[PDB]
Amino acid sequence: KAXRAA
Amino acid sequence: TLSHLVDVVRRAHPDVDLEGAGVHSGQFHDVLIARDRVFRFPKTAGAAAELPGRVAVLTAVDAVELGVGVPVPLSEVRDGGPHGFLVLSRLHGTPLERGDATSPEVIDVVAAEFARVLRAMAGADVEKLRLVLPVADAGRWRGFAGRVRATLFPLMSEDGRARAERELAAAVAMDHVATGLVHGDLGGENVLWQQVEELPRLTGIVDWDEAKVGDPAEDLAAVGASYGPELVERVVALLGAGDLWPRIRAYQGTFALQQALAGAEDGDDEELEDGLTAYRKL
Numbered sequence: 210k211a212x213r214a215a
Numbered sequence: 216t217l218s219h220l221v222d223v224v225r226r227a228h229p230d231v232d233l234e235g236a237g238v239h240s241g242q243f244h245d246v247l248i249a250r251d252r253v254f255r256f257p258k259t260a261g262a263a264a265e266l267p268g269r270v271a272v273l274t275a276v277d278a279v280e281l282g283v284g285v286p287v288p289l290s291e292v293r294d295g296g297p298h299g300f301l302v303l304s305r306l307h308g309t310p311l312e313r314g315d316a317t318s319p320e321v322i323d324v325v326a327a328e329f330a331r332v333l334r335a336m337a338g339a340d341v342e343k344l345r346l347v348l349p350v351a352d353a354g355r356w357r358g359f360a361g362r363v364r365a366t367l368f369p370l371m372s373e374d375g376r377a378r379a380e381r382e383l384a385a386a387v388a389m390d391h392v393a394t395g396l397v398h399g400d401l402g403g404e405n406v407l408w409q410q411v412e413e414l415p416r417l418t419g420i421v422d423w424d425e426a427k428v429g430d431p432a433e434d435l436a437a438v439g440a441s442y443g444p445e446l447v448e449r450v451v452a453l454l455g456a457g458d459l460w461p462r463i464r465a466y467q468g469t470f471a472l473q474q475a476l477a478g479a480e481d482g483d484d485e486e487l488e489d490g491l492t493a494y495r496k497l
Contacts, residue, residue: 214400
């Protein structure tokens, strides 16, 4: 994972 | 059955020390991370097609000449083990901590390391890339919006849904851009650096799973999510990419929802909970 996208 | 796989590796690569070696495991494949080498072993006969997939993506990316390393197939794909294996190089280096990236004495150097890679990616021969890589689909964000409303909207507050509708809408509104190589997940953890005579050098980029012919704004968005607007403004200034800001913000406003939706789909409770915290009061 994560806020970037993962 | 990592015992078998280890024997498959010992037999095919005698000098590989699997004592103190990474294991990533999954429903999908096992991966043995040794010092200089990664061994990927698919678990199904269908997952087996991932091996020529990875070779074709990494070969196509390497042919663009980014001026930084990408993982290299060190072996042909082999039909040994249960469903084949592939040996890739391990790249050395460490993600840049956000505090380090942004120090005044290095921030210009960090900006140009990102710029020179993104410029080589934007100048790739897209006619060649489009024969190998995925191509950004015009329907992508309509479909993503549909799944977010089906899976996540019921877990949100009414303010959550209002916020999520505006973020989905900014992405759905973007016109279709497919003009260069896009990494697709260019956050800090996938970008590897070394101190080369006391200044950061960007030496490697890993995890090309989301790679595509697409919109360069999507990689700038990911750089901004990892490092903040002070860095991405400098990268954008160097590239002359000031036009891309609306697109950059539309990608970035989907990141928490991408994480939530993948947390639901992958069954990672912590990713689901973490991606949804802005979209509910509990």
